Design a protein around this ligand. Structure first.
Ligand SMILES: NS(=O)(=O)c1nc2ccccc2s1
Ligand SMILES: NS(=O)(=O)c1nc2ccccc2s1
Ligand SMILES: [Zn+2]
Length: 257
């Protein structure tokens, strides 16, 4: 229905998802001079030692690496968060060239891509209930710039030709998402939304300040995926990012001075 094409992209989404023009939409531009250091924020606790990846899926708009979220294995806590958020999946947004691809921007700078690690608040019991609540999800966002290769990304890269088209999946067990993190966990945070339909306003965004570096060859492989299904006219999966939305009555807080 919706997508990132020439006729169904972000500027059209509001016609079927009117919350697209809402008061807490994501992504946003992070103005680094306006974001205030908040001494009351805590260090993030990223606890992925027991993560169980299961499968990788091309869903027609990105690829999702899915985790076993049937109990508290990989969780996110601390930072701006109360309680425990379970990792359900991660995916990326990226561009057709290195000068665009991220959803969040930093002083209007676009990165080549952006990783989203999606977690749901276990106090609501299941993901479907969590997305109906203003504190239902926590998404950890990590920028990608092009430079040296990211060793921990290569296993993802190498499975992509097996899920080229929409609706294809493959086994993807024993993947360690810790290999996708930067050194520092300094972050910005603000209340927002899902960045694809249904655009629900249920997310506490935690965006890391430090980008990870990936190689040109790695991101080039992202750009060989297809939005289309098998046998259909080839549409390269590129520019699957929503642009920055109005900040409205929101404050972006920094965990660092
Ligand atoms: N409003 S939307 O979900 O982005 C959407 N755009 C289009 C364009 C052509 C046909 C169906 C739909 S559904
Ligand atoms: N791109 S994101 O805000 O991380 C995100 N959006 C959506 C939409 C529907 C279902 C899951 C997710 S996760
Ligand atoms: Zn995303």
């Amino acid at each position: 229905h919706w997508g990132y094409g020439k006729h169904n992209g972000p500027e059209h989404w509001h016609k079927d998802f009117p919350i697209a023009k809402g008061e807490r939409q994501s992504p946003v531009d992070i103005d680094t001079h306006t974001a205030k250091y908040d001494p009351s924020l805590k260090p993030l606790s990223v606890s992925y030692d027991q993560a169980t990846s299961l499968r990788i899926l091309n869903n027609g708009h990105a690829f999702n690496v899915e985790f076993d979220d049937s109990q508290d294995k990989a969780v996110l806590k601390g930072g701006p968060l109360d309680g425990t958020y379970r990792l359900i999946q991660f995916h990326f947004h990226w561009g057709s060239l290195d000068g665009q691809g991220s959803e969040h921007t930093v002083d209007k700078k676009k990165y080549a891509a952006e990783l989203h690690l999606v977690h749901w608040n276990t106090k609501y019991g299941d993901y479907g209930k969590a997305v109906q609540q203003p504190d239902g999800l926590a998404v950890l966002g990590i920028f990608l710039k092009v430079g040296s290769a990211k060793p921990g990304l290569q296993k993802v890269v190498d499975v992509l030709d097996s899920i080229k088209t929409k609706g294809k999946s493959a086994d993807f067990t024993n993947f360690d998402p810790r290999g996708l993190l930067p050194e520092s966990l300094d972050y910005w945070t603000y209340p927002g939304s899902l960045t694809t339909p249904p655009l629900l306003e249920c997310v506490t965004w935690i965006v890391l300040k430090e980008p990870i570096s990936v190689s040109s060859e790695q991101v080039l492989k992202f750009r060989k995926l297809n939005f289309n299904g098998e046998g259909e006219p080839e549409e390269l999966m590129v520019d699957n990012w929503r642009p920055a939305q109005p900040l409205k009555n929101r404050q972006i807080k920094a965990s660092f001075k």
